[PDB]
Design an enzyme around this catalytic site. Structure first.
Site, PDB file in Angstrom:
ATOM      1  N   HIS A 262     -42.944 -32.472  -3.980  1.00 31.71           N
ATOM      2  CA  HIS A 262     -43.197 -32.084  -2.613  1.00 31.71           C
ATOM      3  C   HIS A 262     -43.694 -30.641  -2.787  1.00 31.71           C
ATOM      4  O   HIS A 262     -43.537 -30.037  -3.875  1.00 31.71           O
ATOM      5  CB  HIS A 262     -41.871 -32.161  -1.842  1.00 31.71           C
ATOM      6  CG  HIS A 262     -41.975 -32.137  -0.340  1.00 31.71           C
ATOM      7  ND1 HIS A 262     -42.924 -32.840   0.370  1.00 31.71           N
ATOM      8  CD2 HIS A 262     -41.169 -31.552   0.583  1.00 31.71           C
ATOM      9  CE1 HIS A 262     -42.703 -32.691   1.666  1.00 31.71           C
ATOM     10  NE2 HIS A 262     -41.643 -31.913   1.823  1.00 31.71           N
TER      11      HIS A 262
ATOM     12  N   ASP B  44     -22.219 -29.494  10.623  1.00 31.90           N
ATOM     13  CA  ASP B  44     -22.828 -28.206  10.381  1.00 31.90           C
ATOM     14  C   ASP B  44     -21.775 -27.112  10.230  1.00 31.90           C
ATOM     15  O   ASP B  44     -20.662 -27.269  10.697  1.00 31.90           O
ATOM     16  CB  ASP B  44     -23.768 -27.842  11.532  1.00 31.90           C
ATOM     17  CG  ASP B  44     -24.898 -26.948  11.074  1.00 31.90           C
ATOM     18  OD1 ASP B  44     -24.618 -25.750  10.842  1.00 31.90           O
ATOM     19  OD2 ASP B  44     -26.070 -27.348  10.879  1.00 31.90           O
TER      20      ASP B  44
ATOM     21  N   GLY C 293     -29.441 -25.520   4.319  1.00 30.21           N
ATOM     22  CA  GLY C 293     -29.936 -24.582   3.347  1.00 30.21           C
ATOM     23  C   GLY C 293     -30.624 -23.428   4.035  1.00 30.21           C
ATOM     24  O   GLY C 293     -31.066 -23.560   5.184  1.00 30.21           O
ATOM     25  N   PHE C 294     -30.700 -22.283   3.362  1.00 27.78           N
ATOM     26  CA  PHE C 294     -31.533 -21.181   3.865  1.00 27.78           C
ATOM     27  C   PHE C 294     -33.021 -21.513   3.763  1.00 27.78           C
ATOM     28  O   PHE C 294     -33.489 -22.094   2.767  1.00 27.78           O
ATOM     29  CB  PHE C 294     -31.301 -19.885   3.087  1.00 27.78           C
ATOM     30  CG  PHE C 294     -29.883 -19.391   3.117  1.00 27.78           C
ATOM     31  CD1 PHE C 294     -28.970 -19.801   2.149  1.00 27.78           C
ATOM     32  CD2 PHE C 294     -29.470 -18.482   4.100  1.00 27.78           C
ATOM     33  CE1 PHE C 294     -27.658 -19.334   2.167  1.00 27.78           C
ATOM     34  CE2 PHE C 294     -28.169 -18.011   4.118  1.00 27.78           C
ATOM     35  CZ  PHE C 294     -27.258 -18.434   3.157  1.00 27.78           C
TER      36      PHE C 294
ATOM     37  N   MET D 168     -32.925 -29.037  13.533  1.00 25.17           N
ATOM     38  CA  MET D 168     -33.960 -29.797  14.225  1.00 25.17           C
ATOM     39  C   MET D 168     -34.181 -31.156  13.564  1.00 25.17           C
ATOM     40  O   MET D 168     -34.261 -32.168  14.247  1.00 25.17           O
ATOM     41  CB  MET D 168     -35.233 -28.962  14.303  1.00 25.17           C
ATOM     42  CG  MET D 168     -35.035 -27.678  15.121  1.00 25.17           C
ATOM     43  SD  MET D 168     -34.414 -28.072  16.755  1.00 25.17           S
ATOM     44  CE  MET D 168     -35.907 -28.304  17.542  1.00 25.17           C
ATOM     45  N   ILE D 169     -34.242 -31.195  12.233  1.00 26.62           N
ATOM     46  CA  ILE D 169     -34.401 -32.468  11.525  1.00 26.62           C
ATOM     47  C   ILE D 169     -33.182 -33.355  11.803  1.00 26.62           C
ATOM     48  O   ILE D 169     -33.344 -34.515  12.143  1.00 26.62           O
ATOM     49  CB  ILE D 169     -34.679 -32.281  10.016  1.00 26.62           C
ATOM     50  CG1 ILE D 169     -36.038 -31.580   9.787  1.00 26.62           C
ATOM     51  CG2 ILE D 169     -34.718 -33.615   9.269  1.00 26.62           C
ATOM     52  CD1 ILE D 169     -36.298 -31.179   8.343  1.00 26.62           C
TER      53      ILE D 169
ATOM     54  N   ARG E  15     -39.512 -16.917  -0.965  1.00 26.47           N
ATOM     55  CA  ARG E  15     -39.068 -18.287  -1.219  1.00 26.47           C
ATOM     56  C   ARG E  15     -38.185 -18.424  -2.476  1.00 26.47           C
ATOM     57  O   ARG E  15     -37.111 -19.037  -2.427  1.00 26.47           O
ATOM     58  CB  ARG E  15     -40.287 -19.223  -1.330  1.00 26.47           C
ATOM     59  CG  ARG E  15     -40.648 -19.041  -2.695  1.00 26.47           C
ATOM     60  CD  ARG E  15     -41.673 -19.947  -3.084  1.00 26.47           C
ATOM     61  NE  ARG E  15     -42.064 -19.686  -4.459  1.00 26.47           N
ATOM     62  CZ  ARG E  15     -42.996 -20.392  -5.050  1.00 26.47           C
ATOM     63  NH1 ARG E  15     -42.771 -21.684  -5.308  1.00 26.47           N
ATOM     64  NH2 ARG E  15     -44.138 -19.813  -5.400  1.00 26.47           N
TER      65      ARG E  15
ATOM     66  N   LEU F  41     -36.482 -36.398  -0.257  1.00 28.70           N
ATOM     67  CA  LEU F  41     -37.625 -36.582   0.622  1.00 28.70           C
ATOM     68  C   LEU F  41     -38.891 -35.897   0.064  1.00 28.70           C
ATOM     69  O   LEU F  41     -38.861 -34.708  -0.238  1.00 28.70           O
ATOM     70  CB  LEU F  41     -37.338 -35.955   2.000  1.00 28.70           C
ATOM     71  CG  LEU F  41     -38.516 -35.981   2.991  1.00 28.70           C
ATOM     72  CD1 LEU F  41     -38.859 -37.406   3.396  1.00 28.70           C
ATOM     73  CD2 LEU F  41     -38.303 -35.062   4.227  1.00 28.70           C
TER      74      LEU F  41
ATOM     75  N   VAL G 254     -33.104 -33.204   1.494  1.00 29.03           N
ATOM     76  CA  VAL G 254     -34.296 -32.700   2.182  1.00 29.03           C
ATOM     77  C   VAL G 254     -34.542 -31.201   1.893  1.00 29.03           C
ATOM     78  O   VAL G 254     -35.679 -30.728   1.766  1.00 29.03           O
ATOM     79  CB  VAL G 254     -34.141 -32.937   3.674  1.00 29.03           C
ATOM     80  CG1 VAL G 254     -35.367 -32.469   4.436  1.00 29.03           C
ATOM     81  CG2 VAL G 254     -33.779 -34.444   3.941  1.00 29.03           C
TER      82      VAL G 254
HETATM   83  O1  LIG Z   1     -41.807 -30.918   6.286  1.00 29.02           O
HETATM   84  S1  LIG Z   1     -42.982 -30.492   5.545  1.00 29.02           S
HETATM   85  O2  LIG Z   1     -43.392 -31.491   4.559  1.00 29.02           O
HETATM   86  O3  LIG Z   1     -44.074 -30.067   6.428  1.00 29.02           O
HETATM   87  C1  LIG Z   1     -42.474 -29.173   4.675  1.00 29.02           C
HETATM   88  C2  LIG Z   1     -41.804 -28.114   5.308  1.00 29.02           C
HETATM   89  C3  LIG Z   1     -41.331 -26.976   4.610  1.00 29.02           C
HETATM   90  C4  LIG Z   1     -41.532 -26.861   3.233  1.00 29.02           C
HETATM   91  C5  LIG Z   1     -41.100 -25.748   2.478  1.00 29.02           C
HETATM   92  C6  LIG Z   1     -41.295 -25.674   1.099  1.00 29.02           C
HETATM   93  S2  LIG Z   1     -40.765 -24.382   0.193  1.00 29.02           S
HETATM   94  O4  LIG Z   1     -40.103 -24.859  -1.030  1.00 29.02           O
HETATM   95  O5  LIG Z   1     -41.895 -23.504  -0.126  1.00 29.02           O
HETATM   96  O6  LIG Z   1     -39.861 -23.605   1.031  1.00 29.02           O
HETATM   97  C7  LIG Z   1     -41.970 -26.740   0.481  1.00 29.02           C
HETATM   98  C8  LIG Z   1     -42.404 -27.866   1.189  1.00 29.02           C
HETATM   99  C9  LIG Z   1     -42.219 -27.974   2.562  1.00 29.02           C
HETATM  100  C10 LIG Z   1     -42.690 -29.079   3.292  1.00 29.02           C
END
Ligand SMILES: O=S(=O)(O)c1ccc2cc(S(=O)(=O)O)ccc2c1
Ligand SMILES: O=S(=O)(O)c1ccc2cc(S(=O)(=O)O)ccc2c1
Ligand SMILES: O=S(=O)(O)c1ccc2cc(S(=O)(=O)O)ccc2c1
Ligand SMILES: O=S(=O)(O)c1ccc2cc(S(=O)(=O)O)ccc2c1
Lengths: 307, 307, 307, 307
Positions: free
Chosen positions: B172, B34, B80-81, B13-14, B85, B140, B115
């Site tokens: 992030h 892909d 990625g999977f 999707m991204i 988590r 990102l 990403v």
């Molecule tokens: O795209 S977002 O910034 O809304 C987003 C989406 C999925 C995510 C998953 C994780 S995760 O490492 O918990 O899988 C961390 C940040 C995330 C941010």
């Protein structure tokens, strides 16, 4: 059409870049009005062909008739004598009076942007003679003055020009108040970049002087400023037309902000579908306010000579 | 052609909004790569027809072959999977290893944007396995996280969203460090708007929580975040490609900033033709730094589990 | 605000690229409406953050309530069952009826674009149940079908995709009428390029078949067409909103053109502030008209089954 | 930077709109070169501040030094005397010689666009003195001349200006060959619109005369054409820089097309990353060719006087 009608009262150099940019941006139909016979029809013709290159559909027409103000959504005033400075004041007041009369008759609901210098004086005179609400008329200043400051800093710092933000207030012209404390780079206070030795205090003082003296620097290089003035005006007009609600520094009616009433001065405002939606008052310290006061005093001095 | 070649490693999707926006902006040729057979060819086909509507000329092609990385100027990794988590960590490390190998062989001079989450972990793993210089790979985070904060504030304040600027750093994810002190509105410190009662401290605390929890809020509304992630990545990629030198918060290699080395974390960087041209270190106070440290510790915890 | 309000009735894949592109282009406020609980709120949220990246100011909101049609300037209908084809006809008629009722009540002055297939059938059903004037409702077809033909030719000829122009008329779907005689390259008849041996007749026959079968080709590649459908719809909507007066091939009410009345079919129209400002009737020869007739007959067959 | 370097040899009115549009479009760094001391530095300064308003990052610098041609990717030549017409020919030849020398020394790999009139003469002179390959130099004509024709027709027909396509060939100036048979509206032959009584043959004859005489019409209105000339040149330059492969009518070296060799004349070409990628020869009838021949003869007459 429900296309906006944008009437440029004055079809000189600023008028001619403004028409060009309206078409590039497909912002609305354009009337290049001027008192000079035929010239605006010629510029309008030239400009109209760019619809092809730009994939736009804006009519661009010339006019030597004030009644073509009828139905204008946006009116931009550059007409006035430019060639001492003070002796022109009452002459340009007469021009504002005549234009204001026609606005009141033909397009009382127009959003008005005044460029004619000294802008902080002329904008209030037009406000008074056009009868339009205080939220529907503004003067060009801070967007243009800050573009210089933002640009000069961005070149020193090697960043995108738009990523420098900065405030210049009070008035357009030599008494403009540059506020060092309100400069940011990518949202980060400029003082961090000074602390880091990426830019020095002495450099910034040279940039401030350069900013103040930019019109004069361009004129001594045997050119004249009109491209950037035009882009700044279109940024303002576009924010109104498209209801962007951009924070843009413009000359607006003061009602107590900075201790001042019954005068126009440069401050950040929000421009949207309702015109000036917000007047933002910076929380200046006493030292900054003293400089703001000098700007207002000069505007008042010149306004008194305009009558 | 000297058009940029942009390879999207992952055509989900991204990937599909990224391809769309590259064409809208005529940024370069696109490869949707892909591991899923044929799907990227199908998306690529769909997307290619938009060249007509957009007046663009970007090829958009699908690929199930890693060697199509050859000659890439920009590589964007979303593979990625996603479906605890932590158990996915070593699986996605394997994916970064395999991609890094192909980058090292096919396009060692590519600018890389990662990403795949957790991004601050995956970006460093890819950095290590691709062998690319530290200024040529980023993750990102901050552009996307701050878009939420900027947007939410701009709606309360009734201003253009872009006119709110804000910094979120460290990582992030749930340990992202929102820095209240670095929020501005039209370049003006947010505290003025708080002083003025245009927005309250309690409102901002609700907005901060909303910002942190936005991915989860979207997922509980039975959607998933991919449009904004895509626009943020393209803003980054575009700054590199066009040498805009925008100040953008991204995950980059720390070499002492904030007291941290040998780790990637979210900080403002300048993105231009030379990649990461500057790493900007905010002059955080001890309280902000404590939160930065927690972000880094979590990244380190997950990185250890990735091996 | 006097920003346009654009209501997307259906928040699936086409709806989600349409919202994205409206924001990229700052075209107006968006409502993502759908019968699925919460999902459109989630997509809307995701999409709203892109205002920051795009320098735009469009609200994007979700809705599970038909009354949010109130005040819509533009309504775009993608809702309908997609999963034989004919058995869905009466089910989607019911959907058009329900939507038409709400349009008649809430936004009788809206400009309507129908996408739900078979579009030439559904658009007329919506026309009949919404009560809107014939110049205020159109169906997606020719802009999208021709994008494929234009694109495929432009790749063979190594020219800008937009520089190929082409006409496909009658209906969307398998009976679409590709008109070889109306293909140009940079305004030059395609036959010159055939005479010159830059492209052969046999190549063009393969491209025509590919054009007709493109939806199926994308679906057999394990994707589905929604990006280009979305860009095409936005090109149409944008022409209306900005009064561009673009010549765009759409499904519109026929009143004698091609010998046909009381039916919708694909023909070039001019889209401006007054909706369908002109219906252009190509001066088809008898052989082209025979194929047009087959398209109309199929539309009529399916319409009869819809009731 | 790998930003393109665009050198404008001549910083008059055309030069000043070209610089403005390069920044609006973020196309590359700009040098405004001129023999007049300081003026180009002044214009460049003015223009540079628009980076802020436009969200761009293009340097704009002035130059009174030919060696600043070094490293130019694109060179645009407007320098020359404008104030009989034939007496200026050898004077402007001298200017082409001097510029060609500097191009050969400083930027032999530059793509060159010549504007100096009579363009079809000056472009060949520059070609000969610069030594650049035939695919790397072109003259302004058809894009600009057709913009007028396209625009005038689009206003009569009430359609988007870009939707009219048209060919004017042979030469720029009074011998330009307007080809009625190659005019389309939304890809549809203009003759259909004549058959339908939407536009008459007599109207089109008045539009053809107006097209030919447009420069003179603008000059008699007490203006001069420079906005559209500038937009047309930028459309050409942009097609090269971004490898759009647009079909654009330009003055190029003829090698047998239309029965003519060893001369430049106006014909559709394809402009991409490799310069002139294709010269397209319209399949003119004998009557159209006779007019093409007159255009070439005049170019030849003036070229002989240039030496
Ligand atoms: O795209 S977002 O910034 O809304 C987003 C989406 C999925 C995510 C998953 C994780 S995760 O490492 O918990 O899988 C961390 C940040 C995330 C941010
Ligand atoms: O009022 S004055 O005529 O002295 C005056 C003030 C400010 C000005 C600014 C510019 S600027 O466009 O360079 O900002 C140009 C002319 C000006 C004249
Ligand atoms: O009416 S059908 O369901 O058979 C039908 C017709 C035309 C279509 C075109 C497309 S397109 O978006 O690829 O043009 C997609 C699905 C379609 C379904
Ligand atoms: O060679 S001339 O000086 O007679 C000449 C020819 C064509 C021209 C076209 C224009 S245009 O820019 O209006 O196309 C302007 C001046 C011109 C001068």
């Amino acid at each position: 059409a429900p296309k906006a009608k944008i009437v440029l009262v004055g079809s000189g150099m600023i008028g001619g870049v403004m028409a060009t940019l309206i078409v590039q941006k497909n912002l609305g139909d354009v009337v290049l009005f001027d008192i000079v016979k035929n010239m605006p029809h010629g510029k309008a013709l030239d400009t109209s062909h760019t619809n092809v290159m730009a994939y736009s559909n804006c009519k661009v027409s010339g006019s030597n008739t004030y009644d073509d103000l009828a139905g204008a959504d946006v009116v931009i005033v550059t007409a006035g004598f430019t060639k001492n400075r003070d002796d022109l004041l009452p002459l340009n007041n007469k021009i504002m009076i005549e234009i204001g009369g026609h606005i009141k008759k033909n397009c009382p609901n127009a959003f008005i942007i005044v460029v004619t210098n000294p802008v902080d004086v002329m904008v209030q005179l037009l406000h008074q003679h056009s009868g339009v609400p205080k939220n529907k008329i503004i003067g060009l200043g801070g967007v243009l003055d800050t573009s210089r400051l933002k640009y000069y800093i961005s070149q020193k710092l090697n960043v995108c020009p738009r990523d420098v933000n900065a405030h210049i207030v009070g008035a357009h012209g030599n008494k403009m108040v540059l506020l060092k404390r309100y400069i940011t780079v990518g949202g980060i206070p400029l003082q961090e970049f000074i602390n880091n030795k990426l830019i020095s205090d002495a450099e910034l003082e040279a940039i401030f002087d350069r900013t103040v003296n930019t019109a004069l620097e361009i004129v001594n290089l045997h050119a004249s400023p009109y491209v950037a003035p035009a882009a700044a005006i279109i940024e303002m007009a576009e924010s109104y037309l498209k209801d962007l609600k951009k924070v843009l520094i413009c000359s607006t009616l003061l009602e107590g902000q900075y201790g001042h009433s019954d005068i126009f001065g440069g401050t950040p405002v929000v421009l949207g579908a309702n015109g000036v939606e917000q007047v933002i008052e910076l929380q200046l310290n006493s030292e900054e306010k003293a400089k703001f006061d000098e700007a207002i005093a000069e505007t008042k001095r010149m306004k008194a000579l305009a009558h």
